[PDB]
Structures are given as structure tokens and as C-alpha cells.
Design a protein around this nucleic acid. Structure first.
Lengths: 114, 790
DNA sequence: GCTTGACAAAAGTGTTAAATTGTGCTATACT
């Protein structure tokens, strides 16, 4: 109840105390893009794309759809199997072998730093 | 003088004892004794206020101790029916912070209102406002149900008092980086020319009329026919010869010094240092005559002859308001007799009972190859090796765990994404362990807050599955040491809701970290003497390649002569010669001569040993002629030989070439101070950091990373040069371009050319502001004729 | 290389109980 009863303060209020800078311009926008990350993120995409080129064509397609890298939408095993015309169980079996292949040190050491 | 613990400092003053030298802190106390109607303090001020409104009285012992309130962040107060109280230093504790209420001057010759009357007048507003509701309360009802409690909610009374100490121009945070600063913050006078401090021997009268020593009333001046000096001003030796403006400037710089680890006392001072130190309150004074029983760094206890027993806990490495250290030292030993009012332990900036705001250094007044150019100064590397100008600074850090909209904040060692090396300095709870070393960006306290829905990016999760690190459901909110700070962890204060601990609604736990650092005197810091001379430390030369006396005795610092020409500051040169006199000792040649210059002198000052202290009270100190004679008698150094002539000069040997400096140079000992603001605190740099919310312009909050601000005047200069691109770059892609700033960062890393700037977010917001005002602004392109920023 | 069925966890979906929320109302007389 005592949290509910709190009333807000004025951003337009000046808290400069020798300097006349209002409270408003002191709030850090947390959603604003981090400059370094949007670049390292574009470099991670590139690093992943190349890492997938080692996998099989069918193989890369499954991992993409399962996480939705290409269409931004994850897919259930049933959904993935329907596009490839196979059972939903087989789709599960494929992912496992390719996660252990991606766990192979050659493809991973680069990604651990990321 | 006339004090048991007082050391031996010879005085030149040709006149007798000044006066009572009244207790400097009394002004703040006497007003409070009246306002509270203390027995020691005739109708009391507290009793008077009620009499006025009566009709249309006691306080219980203080809740907690001063030490307890500053620790628990509560207010030192005594309930009245909680009424804040005043301590022995004439200060208040309001929410854990030590505060002082300045005395207003409100004329109608002028009259000042002391703190007591100030707090009284604030009471009346609460009584009238509280009584205004009483009338409405006692009128709105049937009657005979009315009781005094139901009729009176004391909210207006308490609110006015709490609202006075805070958000009031008279009540100010106690300025304390040295005992002098805090002493002069008290006794400072204010007007609605506006600001000034009180006279030394000034004694306010019952109402608040300044009385000058018997004391004379302001109006009494018309009837019948050193007092002009303040406390800070009365400590400047040779004050008469320096200009009045330079004096005030020199006083301000005395209350600007910082406490040094060693706190050596001034070699050439005035009589005020002793009385000024003990009155400040930061020194330990024996209450009753007796003898000590046991002495440990923690406490001192004295076994009085009377049979009673008193003890004193010594503040050790306590952080001041501005981060200065408040360490006390014991000066007495076991089996030592002591007297009432005698000094037992040394405060921060005191030695043996007198204010030690700086150190005594060997000075040469030659311009040393432009390194001491125009205000700067050069020091010997000795001052670093020997920790003479080294001072400790303490910073406090705070972080709390409370209930959140989504969940509950939780602080723990477990962090979402970290290596075990950053946690290598954390304990179970996740707070840094005592005695650990912390660099910039290290973790002090490990805290975490709920987070969701996460909706993590696909490229993020694919790595999550590859490496098998489960994406945690909470986000990291952990305390890290700010950018550009480093030191050891002194202590931790943990407040947890689980057990006890009244932490405000919502908060579930609090932990404060105390970090302190030894600060070696560094090039860039500010030094200054008591005469107003101040400059940055331009360079620090190795002790070897330093101008040194024929002894091979290197000089500490080298001061330039250029400030002197018609800028009078003459006194600074006098304490330099008197400094060499006091350090070397002297024996006048009075056997048959009894030179005429010493005729006015007192006896037995004729002879003094090496390293003796000297006191020249301001407006009657050592006179000019006597100083010359003292330089004639200037006993040798270890093997009989003379280092300073009767001109205060000597042939210095350039420690880098080996050849002597062709001319005799003025050398001596001067008392200089390390000033408050240091390079470490003042240096700032930023490449990229936080950005404000409303306006995308950069801002530095936690982990300073603040951005320098490019004003209009700077833009004027940039335009004057004709540099169109540099100007556009500063105002668009370095400040406001939400898309540009990130693009240029990407460009720099790739090494590709810098991109083309966009539209400053400031201007975009400008259009919306005009539109919000019912003004239809149209961009009006040459071809499309109408554009939306998007 | 892949599919089947058994199966359990998980996510929807409908059905109900609890809570929260919004509106009306209070008759000595009182401007």
C-alpha cells in the first residue's frame, strides 16, 4: 500500500544546484542501441553463416528453421517435418547429430568468445 | 599559552594576552541552549513560543547516539510532544548526515539572528498552520466529543521543522575536509557582501547584537570613545604586509586543504593554531585532570585523581563529507600526568594540538627553465618517496535490493554471463571481500533483477544450444567501481530485511562498500600557501637533478619570481626567510653590542635552537629590522659552514649540469598546502557511453564517461575558422544522430570512410514541439515538397 | 534412413471462483 501511495516527481524540476540542468536530461535511455554490439552482432551472424556452410544443406535448413534465423520464427518439430515431408521424430534425430557436430571443436572455439 | 598540553612556540607580539579568546563554537551553542531552555542557559525561547498562542513541555533523552545515527542513517533527535538536537560540535544529524545551520543577518548597523531564533521562527509557522486546522476541527462537529488529540494533528509542526533543516538556505551540509573548514562553516554569517564570517573575539549579545571586547555594544560605540580578524584570516603570518584581497583569498585556500598522513605543524605560524585546533572539536581533550591508564590505537583511558574513570574512542579512518580521512592519533603515553583541557590525541590536520594544514618545504625562488612557468611549480621526487604530501581519500558506494514490479531484486554471487575470475574477489553473498583491490569496472556487489519476457534473438539462442548455457530469466544489475577509480576495500555495511533493519518500504537489503586510497602527490595537483599563491604541480624532478645547496641538500620545490612584481603578496617572502631562521637556529651577537634592532625585542628570544617553531600574530608580529638581524646569526650545518647569507640567498648547484647557478638565489622554508581538488578526480575522457533519454545527447551517469559539452561560443569559433565539417560533425554524429553515431563507430572499426551525417535528434524534436503548439511546419523539399522525417 | 506407439511435459482452451473495480448513496441545518 505504501508503494502505491507514492506520487511522482517532476522531470522539468531543476536539480542543478549551481548549473541549471533539469532532471529530465539525466535519464539514461537503456533501450538505445549499443554501438559495439550491433556490429559484433553483425559479425556473429557472419560467423554463424560461415559455420553453417560446413553442414549439409538439409542440415543447415533444419537448424535455421528450428531457431528461425532466416524467418525470425521458431518452428515446432512437426512444422519442420512438414516442410521436408518427414516425421516429426526424425527432425528431432537430425538436430541432435548436428548439435554434436557443431560441438566439434573446429566450429565452436570461434563461437565461445562471441 | 596557559594551556597544559601546549607546546613551546615563541611569540614576538609586543603586547600582552589578547583577551578571554572566547570559545569559538559558543555562538552556535548559546543560541541552542536558549532555544531549548537548557538548565545551564529568564523565559526560554521554547517556552516563549507557546505563551503567545496560549490559550486559543519536556523532551526525553536522545533516541540514539551521534555515532549511531550517522551509521544507521537516522536523525539525532529528542521527542518533544522527534525534535532534532545539537551535538558538542554545534552540528545536527539529519538522516545520517552531519549538518550546520548558518546564522542569518537580518538588519534593523545590523543585527543577526542566531540559530536558536532561526529555529523558533520556523516553529511559529507550524503552530499557526496547525491551529488553523484546530479551529476548523473544533467548529466542525457536535461538541463534547472533542479531545486535544483529535483536535490536533501535529503533522504541520513536524513537517515545518523537517522542511526547515532541509530545502533551506540557512541549513547547509557541514563543509569538512579539514577541522578549519568545518569551524569556519560554523560562525559564517548570511544575508538574504551577502556572505561573511564572524570576528575572532566577536561575542554576539543575547538578542544577536555583535559585542566587541569589557564588551562594547554596537550603539554604545557612539556614547563612549586584531578584533577585525577572522579565525582563518588570523592564521596567516605576516598578514599586515599582504593585501587585504590576498588575505581573504589565502583564508579560503586554508579551508580548502586536505589532511595529510603525517600532518606536520607549521614552522612559522601565529598564536591562533593551538586554540583554533581544539575548538574545532576534531581533537581529543581530557575532561578532568588525571593520568592515563592504558593507551591503544582504539581507545585511551585516564585514571583521574578524583577516582572517576573516563575513556575516549578514537575515530580511525572515518570518511569525511568530501571523502577526506578523519584519522586520530594518540600523543600521550602510559604513566603520563594530564590536566583539564589538555590534548590527548591528534586530529586529522593537527600535530600536538595546533592546526597542521600542510608541510614545511625547502624553497628556491629562481625561475627553473620554464618548468615553473608563470604559475606552475616543480617538486622533488622526495615528496613522493617520503609520503610527505600523501593523503588518504575514501569513497562510499551503495546498492540495494527491493521488491520490483516484475518480481524481487536478488543480489548474489551468481551472474548470468561472467568468467570465474571477475567473481574471484567476491564472497558467498556476492559482495567484495574486505581488503581486496578493485580496479575500474570491477564488481563490488553482485545483484540481479527479474527480466522478461526475454524474446532473445535467434543468433543468441543458437549459441545457447551449441554451448549449452541456459539463457537465465534475470538481468544483471551489479555494482561496479566507477571509471577512473581504484583502491582497497576498507569496510562493508550490510542491512538485511530478513532479521531486523528498518529499510524503507520496498527495500529488502542494503550493502555499502567503503573504498580508500593513498594519493601520492602527483603532477597536476594544486598546492598553495597561506597568502593566496596557488598553482599546479607542473613537474616533479628526480631529487638528483635538483638545485641543491652546498651541503648537497636538494631543495623540495622551485617557485617562480614573476608573480611578485606589483602583485604585492609581500608576506610570502617573509615567512620564507623566517622559515629558514626557524629551521637553522640562531644566536644573536649580543655581548657588548646588544644591537639597536633588538632593543624592542623580548629577552631570551635572543637564542633559540634548530627546528624551533615561531609565532608572529597578525597585526603585531616580528618587525622588519629584527628579521635582518636574525639572518646574521644563522648557525652552521653539521660541519661548521654557512648556507644562507644575511640576504636569505645561497649559491645553488644545478643538479643536472653540475655547474653552480651564477647568481645567489633566495632559499628558505615555506608552509604550503595540498588543495582539495586533485588531478585523479578532474581528468575525464570518453569515446562512447550512455545517452540521455529525452534528448539523445551523451550524458555521464554511473561509471562517469561524461561527455564534454560544445557550447555556442565554441560554435562561434568553429564558424570563424570556416571549418564547416568539423562543426557539423560535432553537432550531428558525435551528439544527436541516433543512426549516425553508431554508423561512424562501425566505420572506424572496419577502417572504412566515415559516413555522411543525418538529422540531429534535437532538430527532429523541434518540429514536434512546434506541431504540439498548433504550428504546421512543412519541410518543403524542392522536388517532393513534403517530407516526413520517419 | 526413417516411422511407429507409448508417454509425459507443455501449452491452449473452456469453465468457475476470487479479486478487483466502478457507481450509487448517506435526510437537523449549513448558501
Amino acid at each position: 500500500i505504501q508503494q502505491y501511495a507514492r506520487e511522482p516527481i517532476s522531470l522539468d524540476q531543476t536539480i542543478g544546484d549551481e548549473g541549471d540542468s533539469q532532471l529530465g536530461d539525466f535519464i539514461e535511455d537503456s533501450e538505445a542501441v549499443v554501438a559495439v554490439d550491433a556490429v559484433s552482432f553483425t559479425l556473429l551472424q557472419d560467423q554463424l553463416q560461415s559455420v553453417l556452410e560446413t553442414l549439409s544443406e538439409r542440415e543447415a535448413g533444419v537448424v535455421r528453421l528450428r531457431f528461425g534465423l532466416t524467418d525470425g520464427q521458431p518452428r515446432t518439430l512437426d512444422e519442420i517435418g512438414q516442410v521436408y515431408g518427414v516425421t516429426r521424430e526424425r527432425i528431432r534425430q537430425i538436430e541432435s547429430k548436428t548439435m554434436s557436430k557443431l560441438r566439434h571443436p573446429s566450429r565452436s572455439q570461434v563461437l565461445r568468445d562471441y | 599559552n596557559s594551556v597544559p598540553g601546549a607546546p613551546n612556540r615563541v611569540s614576538f607580539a609586543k603586547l600582552r594576552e589578547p583577551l578571554e579568546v572566547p570559545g569559538l563554537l559558543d555562538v552556535q551553542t548559546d543560541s541552542f541552549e536558549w532555544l531549548v531552555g537548557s538548565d545551564r542557559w529568564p523565559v526560554g525561547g521554547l517556552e516563549e513560543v507557546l505563551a503567545e498562542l496560549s490559550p486559543i513541555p519536556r523532551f526525553d533523552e536522545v533516541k540514539a547516539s551521534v555515532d549511531e545515527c550517522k551509521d544507521k542513517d537516522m536523525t539525532y533527535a529528542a521527542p518533544l510532544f522527534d525534535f532534532p538536537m545539537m551535538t558538542e560540535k554545534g552540528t545536527f544529524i539529519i538522516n545520517g548526515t552531519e549538518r550546520v545551520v548558518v546564522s542569518q543577518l537580518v538588519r534593523s548597523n545590523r543585527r543577526l539572528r542566531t540559530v536558536g531564533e532561526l529555529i523558533q521562527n520556523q516553529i511559529r509557522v507550524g503552530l499557526s498552520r496547525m491551529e488553523r486546522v484546530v479551529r476548523e476541527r473544533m467548529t466542525t462537529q457536535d461538541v463534547e466529543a472533542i479531545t486535544p488529540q483529535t483536535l490536533i494533528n501535529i503533522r504541520p509542526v513536524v513537517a515545518a521543522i523537517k522542511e526547515f533543516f532541509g530545502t533551506s538556505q540557512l541549513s547547509q551540509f557541514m563543509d569538512q575536509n579539514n577541522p578549519l573548514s568545518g569551524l569556519t562553516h560554523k560562525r559564517r554569517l548570511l544575508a538574504l557582501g551577502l556572505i561573511g564570517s564572524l570576528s575572532v573575539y566577536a561575542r554576539v549579545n543575547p538578542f544577536g547584537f555583535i559585542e566587541t571586547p569589557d564588551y562594547l555594544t554596537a550603539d554604545e560605540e557612539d556614547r563612549h570613545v586584531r578584533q577585525m580578524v577572522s579565525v582563518a584570516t588570523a592564521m596567516i603570518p605576516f598578514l599586515e604586509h599582504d593585501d587585504a584581497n590576498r588575505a581573504l583569498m589565502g583564508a579560503n585556500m586554508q579551508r580548502q586543504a586536505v589532511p595529510l598522513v603525517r600532518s606536520e605543524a607549521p614552522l612559522v605560524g601565529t598564536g591562533m593554531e593551538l586554540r583554533a585546533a581544539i575548538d574545532a572539536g576534531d581533537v581529543v581533550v581530557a575532561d578532568k585532570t588525571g593520568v592515563i591508564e592504558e593507551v591503544s590505537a582504539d581507545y585511551i583511558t585516564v585514571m583521574a585523581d578524583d577516582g572517576t574513570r573516563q575513556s575516549y574512542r578514537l575515530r580511525k579512518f572515518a570518511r569525511s563529507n568530501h571523502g577526506t580521512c578523519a584519522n586520530q592519533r594518540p600523543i600521550v603515553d602510559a604513566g603520563q600526568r594530564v590536566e583539564a583541557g589538555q590534548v590527548i590525541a591528534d586530529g586529522p590536520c593537527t600535530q600536538n594540538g595546533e592546526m597542521a594544514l600542510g608541510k614545511n618545504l625547502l624553497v628556491a625562488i629562481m625561475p627553473w627553465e620554464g618548468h615553473n612557468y608563470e604559475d606552475a611549480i616543480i617538486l622533488s621526487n622526495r615528496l613522493v618517496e617520503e609520503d610527505v604530501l600523501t593523503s588518504i581519500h575514501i569513497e562510499e558506494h551503495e546498492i540495494d535490493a527491493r521488491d520490483t514490479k516484475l518480481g524481487a531484486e536478488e543480489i548474489t554471487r551468481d551472474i548470468p554471463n561472467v568468467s570465474d575470475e571477475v567473481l574471484a574477489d567476491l564472497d558467498e553473498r556476492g559482495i567484495v571481500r574486505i581488503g581486496a583491490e578493485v580496479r575500474d569496472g570491477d564488481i563490488l556487489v553482485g545483484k540481479v533483477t527479474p527480466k522478461g519476457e526475454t524474446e532473445l534473438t535467434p543468433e543468441e539462442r543458437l549459441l545457447r544450444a551449441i554451448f549449452g548455457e541456459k539463457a537465465r530469466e534475470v538481468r544483471d544489475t551489479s555494482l561496479k567501481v566507477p571509471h577512473g577509480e581504484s583502491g582497497k576495500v576498507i569496510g562493508i555495511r550490510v542491512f538485511s530485511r530478513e532479521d531486523d533493519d528498518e529499510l524503507p518500504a520496498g527495500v529488502n537489503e542494503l550493502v555499502r562498500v567503503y573504498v580508500a586510497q593513498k594519493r601520492k602527490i602527483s603532477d597536476g595537483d594544486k598546492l598553495a600557501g597561506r597568502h593566496g599563491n596557488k598553482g599546479v604541480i607542473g613537474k616533479i624532478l628526480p631529487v638528483e637533478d635538483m638545485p641543491f645547496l652546498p651541503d648537497g641538500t636538494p631543495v623540495d620545490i622551485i617557485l617562480n619570481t614573476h608573480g611578485v612584481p606589483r602583485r604585492m603578496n609581500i608576506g610570502q617572502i617573509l615567512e620564507t626567510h623566517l622559515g629558514w631562521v626557524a629551521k637553522a637556529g640562531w644566536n644573536i651577537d649580543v655581548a657588548a653590542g646588544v644591537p639597536d634592532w633588538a632593543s624592542k625585542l623580548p629577552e631570551e628570544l635572543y637564542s633559540a635552537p634548530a627546528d624551533s617553531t615561531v609565532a608572529t600574530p597578525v597585526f603585531d608580529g616580528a618587525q622588519e629590522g629584527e628579521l635582518a638581524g636574525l639572518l646574521g646569526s644563522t648557525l652552521p650545518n653539521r660541519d661548521g659552514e654557512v648556507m644562507v647569507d644575511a640576504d636569505g640567498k645561497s649559491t645553488l648547484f644545478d643538479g643536472r649540469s653540475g655547474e653552480p647557478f651564477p647568481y645567489p638565489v633566495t632559499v628558505g622554508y615555506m608552509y604550503i598546502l595540498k588543495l582539495h581538488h586533485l588531478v585523479d578526480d578532474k581528468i575525464h575522457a570518453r569515446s562512447t557511453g550512455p545517452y540521455s533519454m529525452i534528448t539523445q545527447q551523451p550524458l555521464g551517469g554511473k561509471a562517469q564517461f561524461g561527455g564534454q559539452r560544445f557550447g555556442e561560443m565554441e560554435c562561434w569559433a568553429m564558424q570563424a575558422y570556416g571549418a564547416a565539417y568539423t562543426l557539423q560533425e560535432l553537432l550531428t554524429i558525435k551528439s544527436d544522430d541516433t543512426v549516425g553515431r553508431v554508423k561512424v563507430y562501425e566505420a572506424i572499426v572496419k577502417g572504412e570512410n566515415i559516413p555522411e551525417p543525418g538529422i540531429p535528434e534535437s532538430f527532429k524534436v523541434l518540429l514536434k514541439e512546434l506541431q504540439s503548439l498548433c504550428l504546421n511546419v512543412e519541410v518543403l523539399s524542392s522536388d517532393g515538397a513534403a517530407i516526413e522525417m520517419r
